[PDB]
Amino acid sequence: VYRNIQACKELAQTTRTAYGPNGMNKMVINHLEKLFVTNDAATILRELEVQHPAAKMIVMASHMQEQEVGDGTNFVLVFAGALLELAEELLRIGLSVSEVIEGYEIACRKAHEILPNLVCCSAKNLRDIDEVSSLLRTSIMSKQYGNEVFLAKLIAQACVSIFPDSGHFNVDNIRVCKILGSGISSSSVLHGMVFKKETEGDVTSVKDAKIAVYSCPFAEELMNFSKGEENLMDAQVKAIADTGANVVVTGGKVADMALHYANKYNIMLVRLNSKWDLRRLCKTVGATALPRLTPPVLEEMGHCDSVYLSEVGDTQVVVFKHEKEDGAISTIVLRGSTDNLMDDIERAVDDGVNTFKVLTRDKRLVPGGGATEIELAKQITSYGETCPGLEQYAIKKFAEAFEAIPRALAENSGVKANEVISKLYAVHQEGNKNVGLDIEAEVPAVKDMLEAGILDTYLGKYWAIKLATNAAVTVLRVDQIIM
Amino acid sequence: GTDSSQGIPQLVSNISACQVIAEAVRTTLGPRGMDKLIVDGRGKATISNDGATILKLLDVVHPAAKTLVDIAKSQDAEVGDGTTSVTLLAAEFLKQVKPYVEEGLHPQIIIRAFRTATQLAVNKIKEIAVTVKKADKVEQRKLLEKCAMTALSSKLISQQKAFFAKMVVDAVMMLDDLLQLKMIGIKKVQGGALEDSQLVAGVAFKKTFSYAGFEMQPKKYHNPKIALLNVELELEDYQAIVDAEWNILYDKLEKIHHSGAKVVLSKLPIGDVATQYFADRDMFCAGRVPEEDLKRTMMACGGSIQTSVNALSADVLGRCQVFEETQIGGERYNFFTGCPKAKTCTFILRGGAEQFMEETERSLHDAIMIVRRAIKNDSVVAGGGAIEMELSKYLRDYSRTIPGKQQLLIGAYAKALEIIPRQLCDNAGFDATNILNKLRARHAQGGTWYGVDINNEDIADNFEAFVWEPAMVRINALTAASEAACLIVSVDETIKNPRS
Amino acid sequence: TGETIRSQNVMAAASIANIVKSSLGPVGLDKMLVDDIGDVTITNDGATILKLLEVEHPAAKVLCELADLQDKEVGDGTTSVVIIAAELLKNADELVKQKIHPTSVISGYRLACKEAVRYINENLIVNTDELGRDCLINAAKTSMSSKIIGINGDFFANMVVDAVLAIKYTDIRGQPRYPVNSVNILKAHGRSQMESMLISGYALNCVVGSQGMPKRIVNAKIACLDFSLQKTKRESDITKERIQKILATGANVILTTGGIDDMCLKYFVEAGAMAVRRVLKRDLKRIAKASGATILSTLANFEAAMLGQAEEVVQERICDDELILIKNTKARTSASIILRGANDFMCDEMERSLHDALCVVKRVLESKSVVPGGGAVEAALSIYLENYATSMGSREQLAIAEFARSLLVIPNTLAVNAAQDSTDLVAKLRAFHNEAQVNPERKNLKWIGLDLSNGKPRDNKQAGVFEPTIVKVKSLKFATEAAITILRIDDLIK
Amino acid sequence: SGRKVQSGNINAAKTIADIIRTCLGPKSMMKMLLDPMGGIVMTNDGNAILREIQVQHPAAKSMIEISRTQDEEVGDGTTSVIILAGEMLSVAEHFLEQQMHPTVVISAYRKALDDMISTLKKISIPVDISDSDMMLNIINSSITTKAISRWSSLACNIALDAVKMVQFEENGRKEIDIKKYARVEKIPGGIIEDSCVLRGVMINKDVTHPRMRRYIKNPRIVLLDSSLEYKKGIQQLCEDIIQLKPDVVITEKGISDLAQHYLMRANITAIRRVRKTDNNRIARACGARIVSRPEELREDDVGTGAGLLEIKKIGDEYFTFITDCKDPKACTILLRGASKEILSEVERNLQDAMQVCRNVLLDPQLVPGGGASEMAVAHALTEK
Ligand SMILES: Nc1ncnc2c1ncn2[C@@H]1O[C@H](COP(=O)(O)OP(=O)(O)O)[C@@H](O)[C@H]1O
Numbered sequence A: 001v002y003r004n005i006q007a008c009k010e011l012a013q014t015t016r017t018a019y020g021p022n023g024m025n026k027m028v029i030n031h032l033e034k035l036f037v038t039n040d041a042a043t044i045l046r047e048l049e050v051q052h053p054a055a056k057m058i059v060m061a062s063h064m065q066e067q068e069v070g071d072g073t074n075f076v077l078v079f080a081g082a083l084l085e086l087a088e089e090l091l092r093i094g095l096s097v098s099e100v101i102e103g104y105e106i107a108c109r110k111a112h113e114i115l116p117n118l119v120c121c122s123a124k125n126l127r128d129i130d131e132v133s134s135l136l137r138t139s140i141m142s143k144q145y146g147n148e149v150f151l152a153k154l155i156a157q158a159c160v161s162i163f164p165d166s167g168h169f170n171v172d173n174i175r176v177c178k179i180l181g182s183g184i185s186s187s188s189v190l191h192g193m194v195f196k197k198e199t200e201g202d203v204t205s206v207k208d209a210k211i212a213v214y215s216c217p218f219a220e221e222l223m224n225f226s227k228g229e230e231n232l233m234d235a236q237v238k239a240i241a242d243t244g245a246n247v248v249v250t251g252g253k254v255a256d257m258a259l260h261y262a263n264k265y266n267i268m269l270v271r272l273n274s275k276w277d278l279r280r281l282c283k284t285v286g287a288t289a290l291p292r293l294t295p296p297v298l299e300e301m302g303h304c305d306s307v308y309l310s311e312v313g314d315t316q317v318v319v320f321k322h323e324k325e326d327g328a329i330s331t332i333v334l335r336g337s338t339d340n341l342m343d344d345i346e347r348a349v350d351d352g353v354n355t356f357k358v359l360t361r362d363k364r365l366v367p368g369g370g371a372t373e374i375e376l377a378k379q380i381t382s383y384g385e386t387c388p389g390l391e392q393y394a395i396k397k398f399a400e401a402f403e404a405i406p407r408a409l410a411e412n413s414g415v416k417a418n419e420v421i422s423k424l425y426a427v428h429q430e431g432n433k434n435v436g437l438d439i440e441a442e443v444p445a446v447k448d449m450l451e452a453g454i455l456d457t458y459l460g461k462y463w464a465i466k467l468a469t470n471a472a473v474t475v476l477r478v479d480q481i482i483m
Numbered sequence B: 001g002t003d004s005s006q007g008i009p010q011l012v013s014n015i016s017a018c019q020v021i022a023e024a025v026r027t028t029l030g031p032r033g034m035d036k037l038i039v040d041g042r043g044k045a046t047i048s049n050d051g052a053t054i055l056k057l058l059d060v061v062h063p064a065a066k067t068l069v070d071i072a073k074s075q076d077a078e079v080g081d082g083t084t085s086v087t088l089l090a091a092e093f094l095k096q097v098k099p100y101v102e103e104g105l106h107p108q109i110i111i112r113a114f115r116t117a118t119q120l121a122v123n124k125i126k127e128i129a130v131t132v133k134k135a136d137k138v139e140q141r142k143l144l145e146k147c148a149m150t151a152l153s154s155k156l157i158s159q160q161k162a163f164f165a166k167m168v169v170d171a172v173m174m175l176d177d178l179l180q181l182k183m184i185g186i187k188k189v190q191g192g193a194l195e196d197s198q199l200v201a202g203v204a205f206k207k208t209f210s211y212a213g214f215e216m217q218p219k220k221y222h223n224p225k226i227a228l229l230n231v232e233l234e235l236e237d238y239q240a241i242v243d244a245e246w247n248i249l250y251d252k253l254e255k256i257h258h259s260g261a262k263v264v265l266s267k268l269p270i271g272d273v274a275t276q277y278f279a280d281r282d283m284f285c286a287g288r289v290p291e292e293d294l295k296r297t298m299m300a301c302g303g304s305i306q307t308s309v310n311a312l313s314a315d316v317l318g319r320c321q322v323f324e325e326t327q328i329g330g331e332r333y334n335f336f337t338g339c340p341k342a343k344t345c346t347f348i349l350r351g352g353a354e355q356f357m358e359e360t361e362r363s364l365h366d367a368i369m370i371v372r373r374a375i376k377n378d379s380v381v382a383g384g385g386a387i388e389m390e391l392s393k394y395l396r397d398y399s400r401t402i403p404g405k406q407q408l409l410i411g412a413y414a415k416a417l418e419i420i421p422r423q424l425c426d427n428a429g430f431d432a433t434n435i436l437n438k439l440r441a442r443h444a445q446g447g448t449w450y451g452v453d454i455n456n457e458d459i460a461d462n463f464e465a466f467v468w469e470p471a472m473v474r475i476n477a478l479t480a481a482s483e484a485a486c487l488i489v490s491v492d493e494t495i496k497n498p499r500s
Numbered sequence C: 001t002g003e004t005i006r007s008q009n010v011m012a013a014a015s016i017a018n019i020v021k022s023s024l025g026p027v028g029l030d031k032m033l034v035d036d037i038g039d040v041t042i043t044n045d046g047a048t049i050l051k052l053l054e055v056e057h058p059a060a061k062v063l064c065e066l067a068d069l070q071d072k073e074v075g076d077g078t079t080s081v082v083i084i085a086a087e088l089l090k091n092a093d094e095l096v097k098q099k100i101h102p103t104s105v106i107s108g109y110r111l112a113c114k115e116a117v118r119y120i121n122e123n124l125i126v127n128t129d130e131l132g133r134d135c136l137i138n139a140a141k142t143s144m145s146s147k148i149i150g151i152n153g154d155f156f157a158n159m160v161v162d163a164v165l166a167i168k169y170t171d172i173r174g175q176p177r178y179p180v181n182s183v184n185i186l187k188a189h190g191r192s193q194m195e196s197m198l199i200s201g202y203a204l205n206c207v208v209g210s211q212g213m214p215k216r217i218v219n220a221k222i223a224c225l226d227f228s229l230q231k232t233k234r235e236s237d238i239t240k241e242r243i244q245k246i247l248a249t250g251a252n253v254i255l256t257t258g259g260i261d262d263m264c265l266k267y268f269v270e271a272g273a274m275a276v277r278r279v280l281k282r283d284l285k286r287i288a289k290a291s292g293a294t295i296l297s298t299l300a301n302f303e304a305a306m307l308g309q310a311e312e313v314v315q316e317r318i319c320d321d322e323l324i325l326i327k328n329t330k331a332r333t334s335a336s337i338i339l340r341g342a343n344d345f346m347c348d349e350m351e352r353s354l355h356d357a358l359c360v361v362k363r364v365l366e367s368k369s370v371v372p373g374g375g376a377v378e379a380a381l382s383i384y385l386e387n388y389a390t391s392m393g394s395r396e397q398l399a400i401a402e403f404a405r406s407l408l409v410i411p412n413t414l415a416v417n418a419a420q421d422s423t424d425l426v427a428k429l430r431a432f433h434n435e436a437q438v439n440p441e442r443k444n445l446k447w448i449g450l451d452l453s454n455g456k457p458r459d460n461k462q463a464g465v466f467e468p469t470i471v472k473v474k475s476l477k478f479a480t481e482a483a484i485t486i487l488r489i490d491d492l493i494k
Numbered sequence D: 001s002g003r004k005v006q007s008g009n010i011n012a013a014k015t016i017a018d019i020i021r022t023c024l025g026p027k028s029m030m031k032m033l034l035d036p037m038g039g040i041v042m043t044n045d046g047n048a049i050l051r052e053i054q055v056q057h058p059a060a061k062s063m064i065e066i067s068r069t070q071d072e073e074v075g076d077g078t079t080s081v082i083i084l085a086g087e088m089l090s091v092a093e094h095f096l097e098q099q100m101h102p103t104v105v106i107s108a109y110r111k112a113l114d115d116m117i118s119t120l121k122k123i124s125i126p127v128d129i130s131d132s133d134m135m136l137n138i139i140n141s142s143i144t145t146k147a148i149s150r151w152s153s154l155a156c157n158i159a160l161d162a163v164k165m166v167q168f169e170e171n172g173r174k175e176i177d178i179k180k181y182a183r184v185e186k187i188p189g190g191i192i193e194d195s196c197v198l199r200g201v202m203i204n205k206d207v208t209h210p211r212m213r214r215y216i217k218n219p220r221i222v223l224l225d226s227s228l229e230y231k232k233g234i235q236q237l238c239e240d241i242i243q244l245k246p247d248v249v250i251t252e253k254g255i256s257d258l259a260q261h262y263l264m265r266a267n268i269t270a271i272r273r274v275r276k277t278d279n280n281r282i283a284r285a286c287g288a289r290i291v292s293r294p295e296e297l298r299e300d301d302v303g304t305g306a307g308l309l310e311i312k313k314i315g316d317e318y319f320t321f322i323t324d325c326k327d328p329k330a331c332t333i334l335l336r337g338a339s340k341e342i343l344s345e346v347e348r349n350l351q352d353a354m355q356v357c358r359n360v361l362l363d364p365q366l367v368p369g370g371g372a373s374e375m376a377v378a379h380a381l382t383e384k
């Protein structure tokens, strides 16, 4: 069993450092030989060729946590790693695995009811852009750098507060579009799906339009052949331009003859269609892909509202806004020096918007920065003495497992871990729950988060603790398999 | 590998890789640095002096090397002046901070110290930069050319350099529309002298066997426009093919007057053996033309493009001012000057000695780059590793004030800033340490604008030596170098995913 | 494999330093020193380590020889001089790796030392005047700190500073030379240590010498003997004749060290003598030299005016006994300190603290020129020499700069051995001394030492950690000489 | 190396502690000794285990030496000392790998030691002194589980009488005790019940021909290291001895019959071929003095000792009885039996109980054994 615990320890260690706002970003090369630099732990786990079946269980637990809450994945990883370390030392003491399992389950049950007793909930509602953005600050603060958080929070919140209707939100509604070039400050909030285009024969004031989707991207005898090709192409463009079609998209490049025939129908020619854009268009307007030119029909055709060229961002873009709901889709324009940092910002925006979605169904906020972890550790380790028997060891180890989060959050910030843990635990008796770990000072000092506004969601913490405990338990109940 | 694991060992490996990549461009710093030979496989050895060219053609495979090369290339693309400086400075940062890494200095502390030091340096530069733009540079340009000939001072071209400087800046002033290096191109011609080198506001291309067919063209023609043809020009069914060939040959002459083009261009070979056949056509032709000439003609004169055999258009003979074809060094050269958008200036590299192409392309190109960069910006600082010394002194003085980890790191940053003048005086070939010591002394006590002199190998006041560099470009270079160093420092793992 | 015998020498010196590096400071870790016979030795001070370390390299031989001769010169500083020399050698090797000839480095080092001694001589401290007592008492308290007697340490410091300064024994050529053995311990049973009071004279806790001894004596003569006055079968029976003969010469208070006499009660009243057995040899020798007397075994024949004088002998209830208070002697040597409590067994740590406080106070009073400890001098010298090297302008800039940087190894090792973040402590010390130069009004911010207790920068002249100027100056001289000598021995190939 | 040497030292400590970790308690397991000849030894005592085994690490040698020095100072507990030292040095591994200095660990250990001392002195149950009841209770507690269970009825009262024979009244109330000054008389033969006690020094050496006034009603012993010769032509030393008029003068050289007559002329009894471990206890029990320098010779050269001398040849061997000594600090204890294989162990455990008694004079306290005290102090620290 120690082999499984060792494998899980290694996999937790490889992503332990990326935890917290000062996470050390790693270099990532995938099988098609790119070169990323990313601090997002879920991204690291994606490109890790994890083969050990024991660590696969923790990876699946992390995926479930992300699939349901969208944040705290690395918390699940590090918590499971600490739990397995302490379970391993308990086993080395001589305790049976069953007793450790029972103690862990009892401790998790205790923590789940202790947790809702230390909540300082949301202020009034998802509205009041400034306040709610202040709530959404910590996630983006941690996931990407701590500098441009003040602007990224406003950018990511102004877009999501657009449609707080009936208390229902969807992550896919808030889309992100890439526009390279200027710095991040030039980014803003826009409405409706956006990408590039080529031609300029576009009409701005458009009623419910008609989208054509192209799934497949584009001496007398020579003259007669040229005439035949020209007439066939003209027949095809007439056949695709029938039924009052107004906009056409294709995944290929432009042709002078093709754009000329499109413009002679007063139709713009849109090109540069990405491998991912067609499905998004089909789901957003209820359209379909047409393989060849010869089968166009009115029924197999989706509907947009407005199409025009926007010069925002020092470049020409197309807009497909005001869908059936007329406000459902809400994009975010991003500006950056290259595309490598574009992905980091989009992951930060996603890790903010999903926290907002979680907050929609739960207004409870919990003091982050290690405050809740140390509080839970103190509560559980105090409860441990009240429970005699063989489960006290496992309960105490569960408390020490909660102790690991501020430890990592400090040691990956250039601060002595033991010193800050001791100071935090000592202060936490009198300087109660709302105190946590300060990042700014190089000296191991502590700072209150209720004043500093460093908070994280209750539901995320609850689900992460539950899933991490379940993963540790289900990986402790395995004997071996031939490998 | 060798200890590519969590934390310290991988940072050490990355620092070593950055040192290796900087060593490949270490000695090319300075206007008269060393030179490198690179063979491109099949056997076309490449010889070049500029660092950015060397970096662009390297074979970097290491991730740290790649993530330094991309920063260097981005710096070059954003501003063309100063690429080997940022890589060298960043590698010096990494090498100076390396002996502090294995002692447990957490790399986040190094990142914070580097960022605050860079902010301090950028702030300090603004209090030293001096505006000189208005001081007789556009009108009464004597100061401009006085800064200009510095690229050719104390050389064999010392007597004649004033002529070239004044004349190229005359060309620059009348073409002040954000000039580019590609669209201001020079051409070399065999024979002649250096004093009589001249600049035609256009192109200068020699006519070869496959370049131009007909000679003695109507030079004094005031509407010559290029016609881009894309078909050949030169010359059971065993007789059908003969008939078809004769018909094609007869049809090739349908563009003589029906199309009405004085100059015709083609990408297919042209035969000068049939010059008299082309003499019947009695018009100029172009073939096997380079892409530079094509683009200069398009954005200068605006020649038409033809695809069909009888492609007729109204742009075949549009409005272009003058046509020029004058023999240069006993050989006729084609000059497509006189254009409505003639933002072109091709320089005749006249000279008997043929091996001077490297000399002229290293001298005049740098001179015009300095002129353009001085014109664009307003405020400059003393160069030759002078501003680096001032920044190092200021940072060293400020570091002693702050208590804590950042003190040693800012001191190491200031020490690392000294490598630019050291490398300059090393490439110049003189004893670096003596120059550095004299510079540090006289620069901490005496003045703030002393650098290295490449001629006499002694300290000098580069301010009155008219060695100007814009404050903005130096600030950007320093920021880019510091950010590249920080990006390297912040990385501690690589993930491979080799096959499956 | 190696490439330069210079490198081999510098690595040998570095290894020798690293052997003794961790023991620098009062909280240095111990070292085990085992020989071939299997015997073991425990040690803390670097002098003992180097005096018996089994070295093997000629460069190490030279370095240890210089350390030993420095020890024979002044004493403390062997570990510091070795560490500094090793740091200079490492930095000079790094310099010569950059194509700087070692002769320029040597000249730069010599200039740096010559300037450093001048800087020290202009920024030392001579506060050990007759008006400087707060510094001395604070030094005594700090040396008496980190103990359960710290609360009582204030009274002990007050009682010891005046005790040592009042007993200052002048010398032949006119310098204050306090003898450490003049101060004597005196155990006491009963009341705890929180009621101790200074006694200006020695009083052995023993049998009562006599009962007729007056409280104050106008004229007394110490007639010290060793034999016991007893009857047997200048006098064959040593009870009367020689006693009266010495009394005729002027002997008032006969210091009978031997056994008691059976008819000396009358002599103790008519003459006023005393009889105390098993007197400590050091105590009796000091009480004789406190009055200019010498020990006399017999009285066969010096007796006229050579015997010492006693001015007052208090006979009352002291220490729950009838003590003999032989005080107010001729020379400034007679004193004794009460050691309250129950015995000398449970007060061993506090009496050892008393001895070490006495040692530090006598070190401070001697060599009136003193400098702060805790690495303040090293940081101040580094700050000075960084400016000096730039002001030089020759080719010795780098040599002097590396000499300045190398001096910071002393506070660095002090901070490491104190279990603190060494870089932060040295940086804080360096920053405090920066303001001593840039700011012309913060002149009295120069002796910021290293407080090893809390591991934070601390004003040290107020604290009281002190070092003789001669020790630092001469240790710097020897470190420079050793570095130069090793750095010269380079042009070899092997 | 740095902390590598610390880890090596404590690893040697651990690997030497668990060697004897199993051989304590009333159910100690046996150990195997395999000398490089083929012999095999049964052993329960960890002290002999460490003594016979050979080690190469200086740390292990130092710990073995400290275990020994504890053995001959206080008696038992060597296995417990080794086990405890190994355990603390093993649990220091976790902190020494925290990159945290040994000095703070040392300070924490010292604080823990002080608190453990306090909580032991708090939890200790009192016992009475000079009372046979709980003295025999302690005999049942600790003096048992040894080879004495068959002979406890005699060991108990032997120790209980022996408690008042080695007292020094120097600085307080009978707080000083010395260990070798008890006159041990181990002789096989006869029944074990013949073992008894006597107040005085018991000397196994005697004069060859006791045809002289050996016993006097007030022995004033004088010690001398000089050798007695025929005469001056040394009777001069005897003549000088006559000056103070003693009755017994102890030497360390042989005496002849004519020398015997020359001595009895001065009426002084000398002894020969005696041991220093006998001469020192004779002087201690008699308060005599040794001096031969004529200048120092005074009335102090004679110190009165015993008050009754007797010689008995029990089983045709020359005993010497010196009873009613001036100082009852070196007095006779008698041992009888057949073989010295167990009586030595019973003796040593009895003086262990003697040390128990003297500490009871200092602190009449007992700590609950069987791990009770250990867990009590562990709880005290953990709650503290
Ligand atoms: N400014 C801050 N100071 C201290 N702790 C912070 C700060 N910002 C975020 N944190 C903590 O760092 C953690 C980051 O979680 P994160 O690594 O983003 O999880 P995931 O990557 O799975 O979304 C949060 O739980 C939060 O408590």
Ligand SMILES: Nc1ncnc2c1ncn2[C@@H]1O[C@H](COP(=O)(O)OP(=O)(O)O)[C@@H](O)[C@H]1O
Binding pocket: B028, B029, B030, B031, B051, B052, B080, B081, B082, B083, B084, B085, B150, B151, B383, B384, B385, B424, B452, B453, B454, B467
């Ligand atoms: N005449 C000169 N005198 C002193 N320094 C010079 C001179 N010309 C150029 N330099 C130095 O060369 C440096 C730039 O050279 P280099 O980096 O090789 O070219 P580039 O900047 O185009 O990459 C500048 O820092 C400048 O100080």
Ligand SMILES: Nc1ncnc2c1ncn2[C@@H]1O[C@H](COP(=O)(O)OP(=O)(O)O)[C@@H](O)[C@H]1O
Binding pocket: C023, C024, C025, C026, C045, C046, C047, C075, C076, C077, C078, C079, C080, C373, C374, C375, C410, C414, C450, C451, C452, C465
């Ligand atoms: N109270 C104190 N606080 C800080 N440092 C001290 C103190 N006492 C002594 N030191 C340090 O001890 C060092 C000298 O002792 P050391 O040279 O180790 O003695 P030795 O030469 O006998 O080995 C000095 O550098 C001084 O800084």
Ligand SMILES: Nc1ncnc2c1ncn2[C@@H]1O[C@H](COP(=O)(O)OP(=O)(O)O)[C@@H](O)[C@H]1O
Binding pocket: D023, D024, D025, D026, D076, D077, D078, D079, D080, D145, D369, D370, D371
């Ligand atoms: N009958 C008993 N029941 C439980 N524990 C006992 C008993 N007898 C002795 N012990 C334990 O044995 C320990 C001491 O034995 P040990 O140290 O091996 O003997 P020694 O001190 O001679 O080496 C004590 O801690 C005591 O608690």
